[PDB]
Amino acid sequence: LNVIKMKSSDFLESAEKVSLAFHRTQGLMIMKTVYKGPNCIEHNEALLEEAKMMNRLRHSRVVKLLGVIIEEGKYSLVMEYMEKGNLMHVLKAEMSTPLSVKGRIILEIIEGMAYLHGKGVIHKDLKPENILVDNDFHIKIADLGLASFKMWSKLNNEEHNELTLYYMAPEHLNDVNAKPTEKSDVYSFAVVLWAIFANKEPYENAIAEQQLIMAIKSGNRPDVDDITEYCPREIISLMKLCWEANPEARPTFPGIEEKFRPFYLSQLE
Ligand SMILES: O=C(c1nc2n(n1)[C@H](c1ccccc1)C[C@@H]2F)C1CC1
Ligand SMILES: [Br-]
Ligand SMILES: [Br-]
Ligand SMILES: [Cl-]
Ligand code: NA
Ligand code: NA
Ligand code: NA
Ligand code: NA
Ligand code: NA
Ligand code: NA
């Protein structure tokens, strides 16, 4: 389905920024309020078309943009509701996630990124907080930071509006000139891989941001010995392949899928 021009009145009053919302006739949804301030109707057509463009990225592992709210002095994006929150919340839950499910999660992240890259989309902000999980532990990739919503991100920072580095490729640390590439996303995926088996964030011993940044650029990586549960040797090799310093030596997501899928099916599923 295409993007719906929804209205603020469509949602139940819950006055008392991604939050849960209840559409009067459609049910639970996620709302990201982006702008609240003076009237800026000059940008409406530009904001709507960008939402239409983003809404065209349709894939089983990509979150759906259900609608937009474009009113006088109020602009919001309305997104599919993923009941279980983000991947890091799932990994830290009291109930353990079995290896078969972790393998499926990895495969689905690969499928989603292969789709996005095939559409010429570079995510640039891939991390557990942008990987959302539904009731059945299937995942969908999101862009909650608006890294790909150029127009909406600019709106979010217009001053008249009232309203992590662990997964960033080293070529981007301490460097604003560096333009992210598909290979930047592959590096982020490598660290997500580590997090999936560590059940936590990397670099817990880092003491200072400058220490952490200079260390990673010098070759430091998440502590593979820190994984406490069983992590298949193939997956350790995979993450090492994906966080290699030379970006052009990192594989593609289709290349990752070609070797991970048959391994998932014979060992993990
Ligand atoms: O997080 C959001 C969101 N909305 C959409 N996605 N994420 C998908 C997507 C994923 C990765 C890269 C680009 C788009 C396509 C869809 F339009 C909304 C709340 C801001
Ligand atoms: Br090299
Ligand atoms: Br593999
Ligand atoms: Cl394949
Ligand atoms: Na599915
Ligand atoms: Na990061
Ligand atoms: Na730090
Ligand atoms: Na390296
Ligand atoms: Na295959
Ligand atoms: Na398969």
Side-chain angles (χ1 to χ4, degrees), residues 1-55 57-269:
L1 320 173
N2 295 355
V3 77
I4 303 298
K5 295 231 254 294
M6 304 169 163
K7 315 167 180 293
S8 289
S9 60
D10 288 332
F11 293 87
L12 271 56
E13 153 66 2
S14 51
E16 43 169 359
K17 310 206 163 194
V18 154
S19 45
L20 283 60
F22 196 90
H23 194 286
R24 265 157 209 308
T25 69
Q26 320 257 69
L28 286 171
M29 297 180 188
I30 295 303
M31 173 147 321
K32 189 184 171 58
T33 57
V34 180
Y35 182 91
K36 190 158 236 203
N39 188 37
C40 53
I41 174 186
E42 73 224 63
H43 302 274
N44 279 14
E45 223 200 8
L47 295 164
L48 175 64
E49 292 308 307
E50 174 169 291
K52 290 182 154 173
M53 173 185 56
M54 286 306 101
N55 169 262
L57 301 173
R58 319 215 171 130
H59 187 262
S60 65
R61 314 300 171 213
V62 176
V63 305
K64 277 159 54 219
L65 181 68
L66 298 177
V68 298
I69 291 153
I70 290 167
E71 303 166 344
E72 215 164 59
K74 162 126 163 73
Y75 301 77
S76 312
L77 301 159
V78 186
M79 170 178 93
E80 229 185 326
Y81 176 49
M82 302 291 280
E83 196 218 293
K84 279 185 174 307
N86 65 54
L87 176 66
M88 184 52 69
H89 198 269
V90 173
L91 296 166
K92 299 183 172 260
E94 245 311 292
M95 174 93 201
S96 44
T97 311
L99 179 54
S100 56
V101 179
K102 286 182 170 188
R104 201 184 57 183
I105 285 168
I106 291 157
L107 179 58
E108 293 183 345
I109 296 160
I110 294 159
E111 290 183 327
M113 294 296 313
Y115 170 87
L116 293 172
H117 281 188
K119 292 295 185 291
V121 172
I122 302 159
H123 192 295
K124 311 199 276 334
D125 198 24
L126 181 59
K127 60 196 177 181
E129 289 201 306
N130 269 328
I131 301 169
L132 308 184
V133 190
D134 73 6
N135 160 36
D136 302 68
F137 284 105
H138 297 289
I139 67 94
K140 293 188 183 194
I141 299 166
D143 181 27
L144 294 177
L146 311 177
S148 290
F149 289 71
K150 152 192 198 32
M151 279 310 72
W152 284 81
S153 211
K154 168 189 343 171
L155 177 74
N156 188 72
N157 292 302
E158 312 222 36
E159 292 185 314
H160 305 325
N161 172 84
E162 310 175 7
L163 317 181
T164 188
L165 77 78
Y166 299 156
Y167 307 86
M168 159 174 341
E171 57 264 26
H172 306 314
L173 294 167
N174 272 0
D175 185 329
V176 298
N177 161 304
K179 210 165 120 171
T181 74
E182 294 183 342
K183 298 307 184 195
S184 314
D185 286 343
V186 177
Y187 180 97
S188 307
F189 168 82
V191 186
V192 168
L193 215 56
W194 183 97
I196 281 173
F197 279 91
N199 300 303
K200 67 179 178 184
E201 296 286 9
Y203 307 125
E204 77 198 32
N205 287 329
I207 278 303
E209 163 148 326
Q210 255 312 87
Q211 176 215 9
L212 179 54
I213 287 173
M214 279 301 119
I216 294 167
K217 288 175 81 67
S218 88
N220 274 20
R221 296 291 186 270
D223 193 346
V224 160
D225 288 335
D226 189 306
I227 301 150
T228 202
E229 73 183 54
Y230 166 85
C231 183
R233 64 209 191 271
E234 291 81 344
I235 297 191
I236 288 143
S237 301
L238 184 56
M239 48 179 87
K240 290 183 163 159
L241 184 55
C242 292
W243 68 37
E244 195 59 66
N246 177 352
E248 278 56 62
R250 306 173 191 147
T252 73
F253 272 109
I256 295 164
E257 194 188 351
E258 254 153 49
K259 47 207 216 213
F260 184 80
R261 179 180 294 281
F263 168 74
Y264 164 73
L265 288 174
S266 59
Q267 306 252 42
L268 314 181
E269 163 159 284

Coordinates of all heavy atoms in Angstrom, one line a residue, residues 22-64, unseen atoms left out:
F22 N -2.2 4.7 18.7 CA -3.3 3.8 18.4 C -4.2 4.6 17.4 O -4.9 5.5 17.7 CB -4.2 3.4 19.6 CG -5.1 2.3 19.3 CD1 -4.6 1.0 19.5 CD2 -6.3 2.4 18.9 CE1 -5.4 -0.1 19.3 CE2 -7.2 1.4 18.6 CZ -6.7 0.1 18.9
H23 N -4.2 4.1 16.1 CA -5.1 4.6 15.1 C -6.5 4.1 15.3 O -6.7 3.0 15.6 CB -4.6 4.1 13.7 CG -5.2 4.8 12.5 ND1 -6.5 4.6 12.1 CD2 -4.7 5.7 11.7 CE1 -6.7 5.4 11.1 NE2 -5.7 6.1 10.8
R24 N -7.4 5.1 15.1 CA -8.8 4.8 15.5 C -9.4 3.5 14.8 O -10.1 2.8 15.4 CB -9.7 6.0 15.1 CG -9.9 7.0 16.2 CD -10.3 8.3 15.7 NE -9.9 9.4 16.6 CZ -10.1 9.4 17.9 NH1 -10.9 8.5 18.5 NH2 -9.6 10.4 18.7
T25 N -9.0 3.3 13.6 CA -9.5 2.2 12.8 C -8.5 1.2 12.4 O -8.8 0.1 11.9 CB -10.3 2.6 11.6 OG1 -9.4 3.2 10.6 CG2 -11.3 3.7 12.0
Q26 N -7.2 1.5 12.5 CA -6.1 0.6 12.1 C -5.3 -0.1 13.2 O -4.7 -1.1 13.0 CB -5.1 1.3 11.2 CG -5.8 2.3 10.2 CD -5.8 1.8 8.8 OE1 -6.6 0.9 8.5 NE2 -5.0 2.4 7.9
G27 N -5.4 0.5 14.4 CA -4.8 -0.1 15.6 C -3.4 0.4 15.9 O -3.1 1.6 15.6
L28 N -2.5 -0.4 16.5 CA -1.3 0.0 17.0 C -0.3 0.4 15.9 O -0.2 -0.3 14.9 CB -0.7 -1.0 17.9 CG -1.3 -1.2 19.3 CD1 -0.8 -2.4 20.0 CD2 -1.1 0.1 20.1
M29 N 0.4 1.5 16.1 CA 1.4 2.0 15.2 C 2.5 2.7 16.0 O 2.3 3.1 17.1 CB 0.7 3.0 14.2 CG -0.3 2.3 13.3 SD -1.0 3.6 12.1 CE -2.3 2.7 11.4
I30 N 3.6 3.0 15.3 CA 4.7 3.8 15.9 C 4.7 5.1 15.2 O 4.6 5.3 14.0 CB 6.0 3.1 15.7 CG1 6.1 1.7 16.4 CG2 7.2 4.0 16.1 CD1 5.8 1.9 17.9
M31 N 4.7 6.2 16.1 CA 4.8 7.5 15.6 C 6.1 8.2 15.9 O 6.6 8.1 17.1 CB 3.6 8.3 16.2 CG 3.7 9.8 15.9 SD 2.0 10.6 15.8 CE 1.1 9.3 15.0
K32 N 6.7 8.8 14.9 CA 7.9 9.7 15.1 C 7.4 11.1 14.8 O 7.3 11.5 13.6 CB 9.0 9.2 14.2 CG 10.3 10.0 14.6 CD 11.5 9.6 13.7 CE 12.7 10.5 13.9 NZ 13.2 10.4 15.3
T33 N 7.2 11.9 15.9 CA 7.0 13.3 15.7 C 8.3 14.0 15.3 O 9.3 13.9 16.0 CB 6.4 13.9 16.9 OG1 7.3 13.7 18.1 CG2 5.0 13.3 17.2
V34 N 8.3 14.7 14.2 CA 9.5 15.3 13.6 C 9.6 16.8 13.8 O 10.6 17.3 14.2 CB 9.6 14.9 12.1 CG1 10.9 15.5 11.6 CG2 9.6 13.4 12.0
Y35 N 8.5 17.5 13.6 CA 8.5 18.9 13.7 C 7.2 19.4 14.4 O 6.1 18.9 14.2 CB 8.5 19.6 12.3 CG 8.6 21.1 12.3 CD1 9.8 21.7 12.3 CD2 7.4 21.8 12.3 CE1 9.8 23.1 12.3 CE2 7.4 23.2 12.3 CZ 8.6 23.8 12.3 OH 8.7 25.2 12.3
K36 N 7.4 20.4 15.3 CA 6.3 21.1 15.9 C 6.8 22.5 16.2 O 7.6 22.8 17.0 CB 5.9 20.4 17.2 CG 4.7 20.9 17.9 CD 4.1 19.9 18.8 CE 2.6 19.5 18.4 NZ 1.9 19.0 19.6
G37 N 6.1 23.5 15.5 CA 6.5 24.9 15.6 C 5.7 25.8 14.7 O 4.6 25.5 14.3
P38 N 6.3 26.8 14.2 CA 5.7 27.7 13.3 C 5.3 27.0 12.0 O 5.9 26.0 11.6 CB 6.7 28.9 13.1 CG 8.0 28.3 13.4 CD 7.7 27.3 14.5
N39 N 4.4 27.6 11.3 CA 3.9 27.1 10.0 C 5.0 27.2 8.9 O 5.6 28.2 8.8 CB 2.7 27.8 9.5 CG 2.0 27.2 8.3 OD1 2.0 25.9 8.2 ND2 1.5 28.0 7.4
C40 N 5.3 26.1 8.3 CA 6.3 26.0 7.2 C 5.7 25.2 6.0 O 6.3 24.2 5.6 CB 7.6 25.4 7.7 SG 7.4 23.8 8.5
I41 N 4.6 25.6 5.5 CA 3.9 24.9 4.4 C 4.6 24.9 3.1 O 4.3 24.0 2.3 CB 2.5 25.5 4.2 CG1 1.8 24.8 3.0 CG2 2.6 27.0 4.0 CD1 0.5 25.5 2.7
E42 N 5.7 25.7 3.0 CA 6.4 25.7 1.8 C 7.1 24.4 1.5 O 7.4 24.1 0.3 CB 7.5 26.8 1.8 CG 8.6 26.5 2.8 CD 9.0 27.7 3.7 OE1 8.2 28.1 4.5 OE2 10.2 28.2 3.5
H43 N 7.4 23.6 2.5 CA 8.1 22.3 2.3 C 7.2 21.1 2.2 O 7.7 20.0 2.1 CB 9.0 22.1 3.5 CG 10.0 23.2 3.7 ND1 11.2 23.2 3.0 CD2 10.0 24.3 4.5 CE1 11.9 24.3 3.4 NE2 11.2 25.0 4.3
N44 N 5.8 21.3 2.2 CA 4.9 20.2 2.2 C 5.1 19.3 1.1 O 5.4 18.1 1.3 CB 3.5 20.7 2.2 CG 3.0 21.2 3.6 OD1 3.8 21.3 4.5 ND2 1.7 21.4 3.8
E45 N 5.0 19.8 -0.2 CA 5.2 18.9 -1.3 C 6.5 18.1 -1.3 O 6.6 17.0 -1.7 CB 5.0 19.7 -2.6 CG 4.2 19.0 -3.7 CD 4.4 19.5 -5.1 OE1 5.3 20.3 -5.3 OE2 3.6 19.1 -6.0
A46 N 7.6 18.8 -0.8 CA 8.9 18.2 -0.7 C 8.9 17.1 0.4 O 9.5 16.0 0.2 CB 10.0 19.2 -0.4
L47 N 8.2 17.3 1.5 CA 8.2 16.3 2.5 C 7.4 15.1 2.1 O 7.7 14.0 2.4 CB 7.7 17.0 3.8 CG 8.6 18.0 4.4 CD1 7.8 18.9 5.5 CD2 9.8 17.4 5.0
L48 N 6.3 15.4 1.4 CA 5.4 14.2 1.0 C 6.1 13.3 0.0 O 6.0 12.1 0.1 CB 4.1 14.8 0.5 CG 3.1 13.7 -0.1 CD1 2.7 12.8 1.0 CD2 1.9 14.4 -0.7
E49 N 6.7 13.9 -1.0 CA 7.3 13.1 -2.0 C 8.5 12.3 -1.5 O 8.7 11.2 -1.9 CB 7.8 14.0 -3.2 CG 6.7 14.7 -4.0 CD 5.7 13.7 -4.5 OE1 6.1 12.7 -5.2 OE2 4.5 14.0 -4.3
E50 N 9.2 12.9 -0.5 CA 10.3 12.1 0.1 C 9.7 10.9 0.8 O 10.2 9.8 0.8 CB 11.1 12.9 1.0 CG 12.1 12.1 1.9 CD 13.1 13.0 2.6 OE1 14.0 13.7 1.9 OE2 13.1 13.1 3.8
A51 N 8.6 11.1 1.5 CA 7.9 10.0 2.2 C 7.4 8.9 1.2 O 7.6 7.7 1.4 CB 6.8 10.5 3.1
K52 N 6.9 9.4 0.1 CA 6.5 8.5 -1.0 C 7.7 7.7 -1.5 O 7.6 6.5 -1.8 CB 5.9 9.3 -2.1 CG 4.5 9.8 -1.8 CD 3.9 10.5 -3.0 CE 2.4 10.5 -2.9 NZ 1.8 11.4 -4.0
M53 N 8.9 8.4 -1.7 CA 10.0 7.7 -2.2 C 10.5 6.6 -1.2 O 10.7 5.4 -1.5 CB 11.2 8.7 -2.4 CG 12.5 8.0 -2.8 SD 13.9 9.2 -2.9 CE 13.8 10.0 -1.3
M54 N 10.6 7.0 0.1 CA 11.0 6.0 1.1 C 10.0 4.9 1.2 O 10.4 3.7 1.3 CB 11.1 6.7 2.5 CG 12.3 7.6 2.6 SD 13.9 6.7 2.3 CE 14.2 7.3 0.7
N55 N 8.7 5.2 1.1 CA 7.6 4.2 1.2 C 7.7 3.2 0.1 O 7.1 2.1 0.2 CB 6.3 4.9 1.2 CG 5.1 3.9 1.0 OD1 4.6 3.7 -0.1 ND2 4.7 3.2 2.1
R56 N 8.5 3.5 -1.0 CA 8.7 2.5 -2.1 C 9.7 1.4 -1.8 O 9.8 0.5 -2.6 CB 9.0 3.3 -3.4
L57 N 10.5 1.6 -0.7 CA 11.4 0.5 -0.3 C 10.6 -0.5 0.4 O 10.4 -0.5 1.6 CB 12.5 1.1 0.5 CG 13.3 2.2 -0.1 CD1 14.3 2.9 0.9 CD2 14.1 1.7 -1.3
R58 N 10.1 -1.5 -0.4 CA 9.1 -2.5 0.2 C 9.8 -3.9 0.1 O 10.1 -4.4 -0.9 CB 7.9 -2.5 -0.7 CG 7.3 -1.1 -1.0 CD 5.8 -1.1 -1.0 NE 5.3 0.3 -1.2 CZ 4.4 0.6 -2.1 NH1 3.8 -0.3 -2.9 NH2 4.0 1.9 -2.1
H59 N 10.0 -4.4 1.3 CA 10.7 -5.7 1.4 C 10.3 -6.3 2.8 O 9.9 -5.6 3.7 CB 12.2 -5.6 1.3 CG 12.9 -6.9 1.3 ND1 13.5 -7.5 2.4 CD2 13.2 -7.7 0.2 CE1 14.1 -8.6 2.0 NE2 13.9 -8.8 0.7
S60 N 10.3 -7.7 2.8 CA 9.8 -8.4 4.0 C 10.7 -8.0 5.2 O 10.2 -8.1 6.4 CB 9.9 -9.9 3.8 OG 11.2 -10.4 3.6
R61 N 11.9 -7.6 5.0 CA 12.8 -7.3 6.1 C 13.1 -5.7 6.2 O 14.1 -5.3 6.8 CB 14.2 -8.0 6.0 CG 14.0 -9.5 5.6 CD 13.3 -10.2 6.7 NE 13.0 -11.6 6.3 CZ 11.9 -12.3 6.6 NH1 11.0 -11.8 7.4 NH2 11.7 -13.5 6.1
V62 N 12.2 -4.9 5.7 CA 12.3 -3.5 5.8 C 11.0 -2.9 6.4 O 9.9 -3.3 5.9 CB 12.5 -2.9 4.4 CG1 12.5 -1.3 4.4 CG2 13.8 -3.4 3.8
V63 N 11.1 -2.1 7.4 CA 9.9 -1.5 8.1 C 9.1 -0.7 7.1 O 9.7 -0.1 6.2 CB 10.3 -0.7 9.3 CG1 11.2 -1.5 10.2 CG2 11.0 0.6 8.8
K64 N 7.8 -0.8 7.2 CA 6.9 -0.1 6.3 C 6.6 1.3 6.9 O 6.3 1.4 8.1 CB 5.6 -0.9 6.1 CG 5.7 -2.0 5.1 CD 4.6 -3.0 5.3 CE 3.3 -2.4 5.3 NZ 2.4 -3.1 6.3

